Design an enzyme around this catalytic site. Structure first.
Site, PDB file in Angstrom:
ATOM      1  N   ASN A  46      72.085 -54.367 119.340  1.00 37.13           N
ATOM      2  CA  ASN A  46      73.303 -55.055 119.749  1.00 37.13           C
ATOM      3  C   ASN A  46      73.105 -56.562 119.826  1.00 37.13           C
ATOM      4  O   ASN A  46      71.978 -57.044 119.866  1.00 37.13           O
ATOM      5  CB  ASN A  46      73.750 -54.504 121.100  1.00 37.13           C
ATOM      6  CG  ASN A  46      73.865 -52.992 121.085  1.00 37.13           C
ATOM      7  OD1 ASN A  46      73.129 -52.294 121.775  1.00 37.13           O
ATOM      8  ND2 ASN A  46      74.782 -52.482 120.275  1.00 37.13           N
ATOM      9  N   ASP A  48      73.467 -58.534 122.236  1.00 37.16           N
ATOM     10  CA  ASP A  48      72.804 -58.949 123.468  1.00 37.16           C
ATOM     11  C   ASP A  48      71.292 -58.682 123.488  1.00 37.16           C
ATOM     12  O   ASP A  48      70.643 -58.861 124.517  1.00 37.16           O
ATOM     13  CB  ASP A  48      73.485 -58.289 124.680  1.00 37.16           C
ATOM     14  CG  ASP A  48      73.133 -56.814 124.837  1.00 37.16           C
ATOM     15  OD1 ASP A  48      72.613 -56.201 123.884  1.00 37.16           O
ATOM     16  OD2 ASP A  48      73.390 -56.260 125.928  1.00 37.16           O
ATOM     17  N   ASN A  59      71.550 -46.913 125.600  1.00 39.70           N
ATOM     18  CA  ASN A  59      71.197 -48.334 125.608  1.00 39.70           C
ATOM     19  C   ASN A  59      69.980 -48.751 126.445  1.00 39.70           C
ATOM     20  O   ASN A  59      69.795 -48.286 127.566  1.00 39.70           O
ATOM     21  CB  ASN A  59      72.440 -49.129 126.026  1.00 39.70           C
ATOM     22  CG  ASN A  59      72.255 -50.613 125.886  1.00 39.70           C
ATOM     23  OD1 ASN A  59      71.901 -51.298 126.843  1.00 39.70           O
ATOM     24  ND2 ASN A  59      72.483 -51.124 124.684  1.00 39.70           N
ATOM     25  N   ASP A 101      77.696 -41.843 136.342  1.00 38.80           N
ATOM     26  CA  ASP A 101      77.715 -43.236 136.796  1.00 38.80           C
ATOM     27  C   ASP A 101      79.050 -43.777 137.313  1.00 38.80           C
ATOM     28  O   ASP A 101      79.081 -44.831 137.952  1.00 38.80           O
ATOM     29  CB  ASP A 101      77.196 -44.140 135.668  1.00 38.80           C
ATOM     30  CG  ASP A 101      76.685 -45.482 136.172  1.00 38.80           C
ATOM     31  OD1 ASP A 101      75.893 -45.487 137.140  1.00 38.80           O
ATOM     32  OD2 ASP A 101      77.061 -46.527 135.591  1.00 38.80           O
TER      33      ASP A 101
END
Length: 129
Positions: A46, A48, A59, A101
């Protein structure tokens, strides 16, 4: 390893994903299809600097450690490479933490854009489950 549609549905059901947190099995197979095309070795980097790993593209910024994502958390407490195994156990266990989450399966962009609100049962039709 590249899974067959029904083969993966069977593996996921065995690992307790069917109806996990209210998400029917078709949801998980659909997410896998569009996130990695059923390939456990899929990786995507990605902008980032983080990287997504495995059939469910988990991720590295928050869930696993790949040694190259600064200030990242390792919430699933596993090296990201473990998410590329032909044995999906690690991916499933981590996905269970992710989906609990708070945002549910919306944590997976492909599920939200390509599975959510569609007839997901279609992904397990014809399967001996």
């Amino acid at each position: 390893k590249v899974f067959g549609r029904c083969e993966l549905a069977a593996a996921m059901k065995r690992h307790g994903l069917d109806n996990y947190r209210g998400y029917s099995l078709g949801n998980w197979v659909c997410a896998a299809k569009f996130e990695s095309n059923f390939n456990t070795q899929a990786t995507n980097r990605n902008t980032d600097g983080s990287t997504d790993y495995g059939i469910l593209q988990i991720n590295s910024r928050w869930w696993c450690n790949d040694g190259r994502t600064p200030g990242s958390r390792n919430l699933c407490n596993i090296p990201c490479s473990a998410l590329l195994s032909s044995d999906i156990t690690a991916s499933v266990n981590c996905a269970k933490k992710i989906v609990s989450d708070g945002n549910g399966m919306n944590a997976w962009v492909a599920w939200r854009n390509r599975c959510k609100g569609t007839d997901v049962q279609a992904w397990i039709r014809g399967c001996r489950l």
